[PDB]
Amino acid sequence: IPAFHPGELNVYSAPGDVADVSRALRLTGRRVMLVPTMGALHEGHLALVRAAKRVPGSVVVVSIFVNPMQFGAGGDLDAYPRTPDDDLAQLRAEGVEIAFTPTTAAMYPDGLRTTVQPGPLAAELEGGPRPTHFAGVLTVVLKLLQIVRPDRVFFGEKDYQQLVLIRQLVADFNLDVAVVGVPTVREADGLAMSSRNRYLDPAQRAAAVALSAALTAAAHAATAGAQAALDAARAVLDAAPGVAVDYLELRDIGLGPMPLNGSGRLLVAARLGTTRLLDNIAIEIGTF
Amino acid sequence: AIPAFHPGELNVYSAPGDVADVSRALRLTGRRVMLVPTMGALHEGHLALVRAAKRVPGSVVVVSIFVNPMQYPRTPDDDLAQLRAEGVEIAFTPTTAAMYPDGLRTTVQPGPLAAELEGGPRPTHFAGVLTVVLKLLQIVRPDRVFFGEKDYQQLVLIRQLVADFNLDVAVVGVPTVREADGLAMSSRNRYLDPAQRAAAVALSAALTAAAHAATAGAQAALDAARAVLDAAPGVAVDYLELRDIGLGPMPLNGSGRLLVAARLGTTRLLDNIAIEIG
Ligand SMILES: CC(C)[C@@H](N)C(=O)NS(=O)(=O)OC[C@H]1O[C@@H](n2cnc3c(N)ncnc32)[C@H](O)[C@@H]1O
Ligand SMILES: CC(C)[C@@H](N)C(=O)NS(=O)(=O)OC[C@H]1O[C@@H](n2cnc3c(N)ncnc32)[C@H](O)[C@@H]1O
């Protein structure tokens, strides 16, 4: 096997390497935590890291890979922020012991051959205009799960539809891994932290508070029912300078069609100039 | 707590979590878990897979029996009896509802080979096969998984699954078991009337002739097989194709595979054979 130095950051590029190291560690009793990322790490990613780190006797594997398969059209791929130096320094600071940084050739030696076909949820919301996006995501996440074989895998609630689809993947293929959702990390004014936030100028940055404002307003209005919750969110988004709403939708927590008046998730996607922002929140209908 | 396991006896589990728990406990005790996926109605062709799995030192054999609705009689008690007689220690016999508790939701989409040959008449067949095999691999987590060369295209697509999804299992293909005259063993053979069963020998005869004709090249191999099939009455050839061993285009020399499918009345038969060109 390759070398592993405990209490140090170990960086592996080869899938076989991180696989052997993970397998070895699992036999020594350490529980293996996996945090899949596309790099450009910020505080939101670090909350997943810290959630992983908190599991007693955990070894934390953070993968960094920009997956060509989940990008669909033009140059979303070439436009994705890549800050690899900073990424490894943050992981060192967090006391993460393993970074997995595979090449495209190592992940896709045969191009797109066998792939994962998600359920119908992948055609909705984010999947609407990007009908192959989630197939890309679930395919890469399945591969990472098989390479690393973790006990638990960590995803943010910020990408709630992704989190849900990953739960379906784990259930539907009988994967032996626990999926842990981690609450969204927000700036001081409520803005959901995202790498995309850097594409916002100072005007747009100011208008952007509206997504989380609309959602939290909705969450409190919801004592008055679903229509009140939705109308409150919409009013806030309409009061906001140059925020173009793509969707604002209230669903059950599994992203089915809402109960009558139960527990749910309110999701929004909006454009500020060229920058598409996402946010979501837990909603309880008729409950203070 | 781990379900009861009695060594040297046939232990039957219907719940995925149960066989998962048992397989995990056994590997920890120094056993090597071998998986043999079947749809039951076992014959000597299936038992060859079993015997291959058994001879691995330290092996514990898991035979799954599950009829996939995603990819016609049944004998549960007789199947279990055969496994008992082979000395298999675990049979996994789940229900459709246990395997598919949420219906068909996430599935495996095979590569383009799935659209070819057997995927011609049945264009969603291999999607069903790869999905269920992926599920059984995750449930049992075997060290090795066994498939017959009889279903060569199936075997090749399973190797593609294992490669593409980085699965940590060895895929072992087991030679086709044949009747005394060379007909590949299949439950479908019993449906053949005496004339059809006589004519059916032409598939295997055609392929072995080709394998021997191939010292004279690719075209001589193909022409030999076609002549043999042309000498049989009531044999409707669906395809006869020579490909490389991974089922790509045949290279000019080197190793190949010759595959045939044909219909004798209502019964469809398949066969294939290794070929070495020149
Ligand atoms: C690799 C695969 C999972 C890919 N589709 C992906 O989402 N890559 S990612 O780098 O954009 O994000 C990695 C993880 O960080 C999570 N994340 C991002 N921002 C936040 C935040 N503000 N609060 C909490 N969690 C967050 C995000 O939901 C995801 O689970
Ligand atoms: C579950 C999945 C594998 C499913 N598609 C399937 O094939 N079920 S099956 O019961 O019909 O086949 C079980 C296994 O037995 C193998 N098999 C059958 N006949 C023979 C034979 N004559 N010689 C060698 N091997 C043989 C067959 O190729 C397969 O790997």
Coordinates of C-alpha atoms and ligand atoms in Angstrom, one line a residue, chain B residues 36-40 42-46 48-49 64 66 71-72 125 129 132-133 136 146-151 154 174-178 184-186, ligand 2:
Chain B
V36 CA -23.3 -16.9 -7.6
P37 CA -26.3 -15.0 -9.0
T38 CA -29.1 -17.1 -10.4
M39 CA -32.8 -17.0 -11.2
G40 CA -33.3 -20.5 -9.7
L42 CA -30.9 -24.8 -11.3
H43 CA -29.2 -27.2 -13.7
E44 CA -25.7 -28.5 -14.2
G45 CA -24.8 -25.2 -16.0
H46 CA -25.5 -23.3 -12.8
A48 CA -20.6 -25.4 -12.5
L49 CA -20.6 -21.8 -11.2
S64 CA -28.8 -15.7 -4.9
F66 CA -34.2 -14.0 -7.6
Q71 CA -34.7 -8.0 -17.0
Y72 CA -41.8 -19.8 -16.9
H125 CA -32.7 -6.1 -20.8
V129 CA -29.4 -7.1 -15.3
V132 CA -29.9 -6.1 -10.0
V133 CA -26.3 -7.3 -10.1
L136 CA -26.6 -8.0 -5.1
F146 CA -19.3 -15.9 -10.9
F147 CA -21.1 -15.7 -14.3
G148 CA -21.3 -18.2 -17.1
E149 CA -19.7 -17.7 -20.6
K150 CA -23.0 -19.0 -21.9
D151 CA -24.3 -15.4 -21.6
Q154 CA -23.9 -10.3 -20.1
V174 CA -17.0 -19.9 -16.0
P175 CA -16.9 -22.1 -19.2
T176 CA -20.3 -23.1 -20.8
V177 CA -21.6 -26.5 -19.7
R178 CA -22.9 -28.5 -22.7
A184 CA -25.2 -25.5 -24.5
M185 CA -27.3 -26.4 -21.3
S186 CA -30.3 -24.2 -20.9
Ligands
LIG2 C1 -29.1 -13.0 -12.2 C2 -28.5 -12.8 -13.6 C3 -27.1 -13.4 -13.7 C4 -29.4 -13.3 -14.7 N1 -29.4 -12.5 -15.9 C5 -29.1 -14.8 -15.1 O1 -28.4 -15.1 -16.1 N2 -29.8 -15.7 -14.4 S1 -29.7 -17.3 -14.8 O2 -30.3 -18.2 -13.7 O3 -30.4 -17.5 -16.0 O4 -28.3 -17.6 -15.0 C6 -27.4 -17.9 -13.8 C7 -25.9 -17.9 -14.2 O5 -25.8 -19.3 -14.7 C8 -25.1 -19.2 -15.9 N3 -25.4 -20.3 -16.8 C9 -26.6 -20.7 -17.3 N4 -26.4 -21.8 -18.1 C10 -25.1 -22.1 -18.2 C11 -24.3 -23.0 -18.8 N5 -24.9 -23.9 -19.6 N6 -23.0 -23.0 -18.6 C12 -22.4 -22.1 -17.8 N7 -23.1 -21.2 -17.2 C13 -24.5 -21.2 -17.3 C14 -25.5 -17.9 -16.6 O6 -24.6 -17.5 -17.6 C15 -25.5 -16.9 -15.4 O7 -24.2 -16.4 -15.1

